């Protein structure tokens, strides 16, 4: 098929190449599915928490977990505004699509969790990216898992679980999924290239891919895919590690900020920021990447770096409550220019 992300995906629970402590812990959890409480997974993005959830479902239910079952449901909010959600269905479990807007998120969650509950074995619900809720959907999930804790199980995967409210963190078991080290990523890549028998003279490129993706399985696999198809399935030690337009644009913006510090530079930074933000993206990761790229400049000293990180934290706090993002982004950029100049 198309990508290594979904093709050579670990099917069975015994086919995990990562650390065995988490696998043993979830095997202990899956030993008695009747006594299994509500579960919450937190860790770095791209670690593969959904893979652990699918493996746990395989251990509890059995074969047939992966079923397409594309379904479309209609939901009505207050006044009159039709909403559409391409929620994915499956036997014995269902996954929630968080693609809906945060403001009108109560109706879909309430209706679909009531539909999965009914009155009646149990059916499990997987809710990815639970941090996007405005605490109203969080309260809805809290009440649903409190009152109907007889036939429903919630298994949520998320990264940077701080916005998740305290009551939910108390009622759900905390699963930690640390990102694999460079050795495990290199072993996985070696297994892949042995499976397809592609050309490979030096293993240093595998370590470069492993360490350049910051411990992300999907990013490393896709980076391997990009260079393999562009080199006629023949990796070379002299082949540079390519990066998306995202990192190139971020680095160019950082270089422009460091070099040129002026109002004209500020409005070109505004144009670049608008061009980036035109692709339906959150600004927290953009601010984090800009801060990390600014701290990577060798010409800066410790005082400028300290000021940059302090104002980055302050403007991230401002963005946490702010409705817009361009205000805080431009404020952080202007503060960085003021500090550098």
């Amino acid at each position: 098929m198309s990508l290594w992300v979904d093709k050579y995906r670990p099917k069975s629970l015994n086919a995990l190449s990562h650390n065995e402590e988490l696998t043993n812990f979830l095997k202990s959890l899956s030993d008695q599915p009747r006594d299994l409480p509500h579960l919450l997974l937190y860790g770095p993005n791209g670690t593969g928490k959904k893979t652990r959830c699918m493996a746990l479902l395989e251990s509890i239910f059995g074969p047939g977990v992966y079923r397409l079952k594309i379904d479309v449901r209609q939901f009505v909010t207050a006044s009159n505004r039709k909403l559409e959600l391409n929620v994915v269905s499956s036997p014995y479990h269902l996954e929630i699509t968080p693609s809906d807007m945060g403001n009108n998120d109560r109706i879909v969650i309430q209706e679909l969790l009531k539909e999965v509950a009914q009155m009646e074995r149990y059916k499990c619900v997987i809710i990815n990216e639970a941090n996007s809720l405005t605490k109203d959907a969080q309260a809805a999930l809290r009440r649903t898992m409190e009152k109907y804790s007889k036939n429903i199980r919630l298994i949520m995967v998320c990264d940077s679980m701080s916005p998740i409210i305290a009551p939910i963190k108390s009622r759900c078991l905390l699963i930690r999924c640390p990102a694999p080290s460079d050795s495990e990523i290199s072993t996985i890549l070696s297994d892949v290239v042995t499976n397809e028998r592609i050309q490979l003279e030096t293993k240093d490129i595998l370590k470069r891919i492993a360490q350049a993706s910051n411990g992300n399985l999907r990013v490393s696999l896709l980076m391997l895919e990009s260079m393999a198809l562009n080199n006629e399935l023949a990796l070379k030690s002299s082949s540079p590690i390519i990066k998306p337009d995202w990192i190139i644009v971020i680095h160019k913006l950082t270089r422009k900020i460091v070099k040129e510090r002026s109002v004209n530079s500020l409005i070109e930074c505004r144009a670049v920021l608008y061009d980036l933000l035109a692709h339906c993206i959150p600004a927290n990761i953009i601010l984090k990447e800009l801060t990390f790229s600014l701290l990577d400049v060798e010409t800066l000293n410790t005082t400028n770096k300290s000021s940059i990180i302090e104002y980055s934290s302050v403007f991230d706090e401002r963005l946490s409550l702010g409705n817009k993002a361009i205000f805080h982004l431009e404020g952080f950029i202007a503060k960085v220019m003021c500090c550098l100049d």
């Binding site: 409480p37 937190y42 309430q110 679980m161 905390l174």
Partner: protein, 330 residues
């Protein structure tokens, strides 16, 4: 069967372990019919829902659950009009007629109880509309408000409803309860596992019960017959090891930005929650007696600011890096 959180949920008023005052007030109310409006508040997972359910079970009974009890939550629509009409309709219904069996067995009060959970997330207009319904219709009905945020409830509601604070379930407040649960479920602890679980838990018993259940499941799966140690519950609780915290403190002590940033990145790629790291760093810094007063005050202020930032739904990596940089430069 059932998870230990719901399997061991109290069903009687005397099954509580720490909230003595509210429970004994309700018990002395059981022989009377002058129950006032109650405002239950406190830390999460202190058993306010369990307490109100036990009180309702002692008062009315399963026959009168479906006739004299209305519960409104966030699971359905909670608009101004819907809440207004529903509360006006239910708070106007006449006194129900219990059977002779109910009167013979349980003391049936002549009033009805309306329970409104998570009242903190209710709009001010709804509370203003419900003020007069609570006041002038209270002859044969009562309202119970349960919320973990007192400030989210406006001043007039805090006056009509009796304020029943729920104490934080500390170590000694739940040692006996965890011991009873361990004996009932055959869970073995060596010296201080239960005390360690309550120390880890933020003043609640539900998280501790879940942690104990996870530890018991792990011990049963291991099958070697040994007892649970403090290291196991610390690992399953997300507690940072002491050696790694010592390494963090040592790297912060050195005044270099590059090594600190690299180690912060290496720590964040492990996916550890920053709140636990902040708490462990704070308790280590206060516990240590090698620092003077000004440094302790400054680091306490920075830790409080970082905790507020983290609780405000911000990024853990940036906040922890900023906190460690600020600490290193003191």
């Amino acid at each position: 069967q059932q998870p230990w959180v719901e399997k061991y949920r109290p069903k009687n008023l005397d099954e509580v372990t720490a909230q003595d005052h509210a429970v004994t007030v309700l018990k002395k109310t059981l022989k009377s019919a002058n129950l006032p409006h109650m405002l239950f508040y406190g830390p999460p997972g202190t058993g306010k829902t369990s307490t109100i359910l036990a009180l309702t079970k002692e008062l009315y009974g399963p026959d009168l659950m479906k006739s004299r009890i209305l519960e409104l939550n966030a699971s359905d629509e909670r608009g101004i009009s819907i809440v207004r009409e529903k509360v006006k309709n239910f708070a106007r219904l006449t006194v129900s007629k219990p059977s002779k069996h109910d009167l013979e067995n349980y003391p049936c009060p002549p009033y009805k109880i309306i329970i409104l959970d998570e009242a903190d997330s209710m709009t001010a207009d709804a509370q203003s509309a419900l003020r007069r319904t609570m006041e002038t219709y209270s002859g044969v009905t009562r309202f119970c408000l349960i919320c973990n945020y007192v400030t989210r409830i406006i001043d007039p509601l805090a006056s009509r409803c009796s304020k029943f604070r729920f104490k934080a379930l500390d170590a000694s407040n739940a040692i006996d309860r965890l011991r009873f649960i361990s004996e009932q479920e055959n869970v073995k602890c060596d010296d201080g596992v239960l005390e360690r679980i309550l120390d880890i838990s933020a003043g609640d018993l539900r998280r501790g019960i879940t942690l104990l259940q996870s530890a018991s499941k792990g011990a049963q799966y291991l099958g070697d017959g040994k007892n649970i140690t403090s290291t196991q519950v610390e690992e399953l609780a997300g507690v940072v090891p002491h050696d790694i915290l010592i390494e963090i403190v040592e790297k912060v002590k050195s005044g270099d930005f590059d090594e600190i940033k690299k180690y912060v990145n290496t720590f964040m790629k492990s996916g550890w929650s920053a709140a636990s790291v902040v708490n462990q760093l704070h308790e280590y810094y206060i516990t240590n007696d090698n620092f003077d007063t000004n440094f302790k005050n400054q680091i306490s202020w920075l830790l409080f600011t970082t905790d507020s930032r983290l609780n405000n739904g911000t990024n853990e990596h940036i906040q922890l890096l900023n906190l460690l940089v600020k600490i290193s430069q003191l």
